[PDB]
């Protein structure tokens with residue numbers, strides 16, 4: 304078992320804290336959903352390779368430009384998160400989060416993750432977004448943004464239903480293992 | 483952590499910590515407020531525990547078992563005693579507020595109605611100045627601590643054996659040297675989200691809503707001040723690089 308480090312970046316509304324919690328518990332909290340995530344070391348076996356993947360959140364560091372980069376040293380894989388129910392989170396990816404991560408984490412693979420995929424066909428989400436001349440992020444819009452920012456890959460998941468969550472972290476492990 | 487506090491905070495939430503017959507007595511809004519206050523205290527207990535690993539297991543073990551050059555242990559764990567003093571005192575205050583609130587005859591059933599004042603006291607006056615001074619010093623020494631650690635692990639045989647020995651037990655899985663340093667740096671930016679969520683469920687008493695609104699502002703002011711006082715120290719950085727910053 305080799306040790307690798309994962310950091311998740313994105314706007315607070317991207318659901319990054321929830322994603323780390325649901326993955327680390329292999330359960331969406333039934334009684335209480337924690338406000339914060341400390342850290343976790345997940346035991347993962349991907350394609351026959353055992354890895355200890357340390358997980359870190361950046362929530363709470365968004366307004367602190369000198370505190371926030373302290374989470375980046377020795378990162379092996381980045382999860383760049385946006386929420387499918389929020390086109391505004393996707394817009395902050397190419398010129399806010401992407402140049403920051405490429406500066407502090409040069410040559411580190413980035414996986415662009417479209418969170419809350421269960422809201423793409425949610426009637427309440429569609430009605431709410433239509434008030435600001437918006438709609439849920441389309442799969443091609445996510446892939447095109449991932450392609451543009453030089454992401455290693457594009458993935459989607461739902462922390463609510465757990466669909467695609469395990470796949471995201473197993474792929475992040477494969478990317479962290481690459482040369 | 484001491485066994486008494488570990489057991490008091492073993493449950494995933496306040497709703498699972500208290501007896502079910504006591505839980506049934508409160509309105510939904512109170513249970514929501516209490517679950518978030520419990521998360522603030524439980525995470526504070528864990529943060530204090532991280533500082534005890536750094537001071538007792540790491541720092542003191544290196545002083546008592548290794549022959550490192552002077553200034554090396556201090557370089558690895560900057561301001562650890564001051565940080566442990568700030569947070570052990572804050573934890574004592576939170577645990578005393580919980581203790582006074584326990585029902586007679588119970589060691590688990592309680593409701594905390596007045597957290598705002600405690601948070602205002604912690605994030606104002608001398609205690610706030612000390613938190614600001616300590617985190618500004620610690621976070622400016624973060625990169626240097628990591629680089630000094632990496633260099634020692636890769637070049638010093640006895641240091642590497644010491645690290646592998648004390649971090650072998652499973653209860654230290656999440657708490658290696660570098661992980662401890664980042665857990666502490668990240669602690670201060672967890673406070674605004676915990677406090678805002680407590681405030682969300684504290685509208686019932688107007689004075690409590692006001693005190694938590696004041697506490698949230700004091701915490702954000704502290705973070706802004708700490709963030710503005712950071713400049714990473716670099717071992718080997720020449721004066722020219724510094725004054726041409």
Ligand SMILES: CC(=O)n1cc2ccc(N)cc2c1
Nearest residue numbers: 368369372402403404405406
């Ligand atoms: C947050 C911060 O301090 N940054 C420094 C940068 C330098 C270059 C760049 N493309 C992004 C940066 C982001």
Ligand SMILES: CC(=O)n1cc2ccc(N)cc2c1
Nearest residue numbers: 336337338675676678679682
């Ligand atoms: C800071 C705040 O208001 N919140 C954080 C949360 C975490 C989980 C959840 N279900 C609601 C939250 C609401």
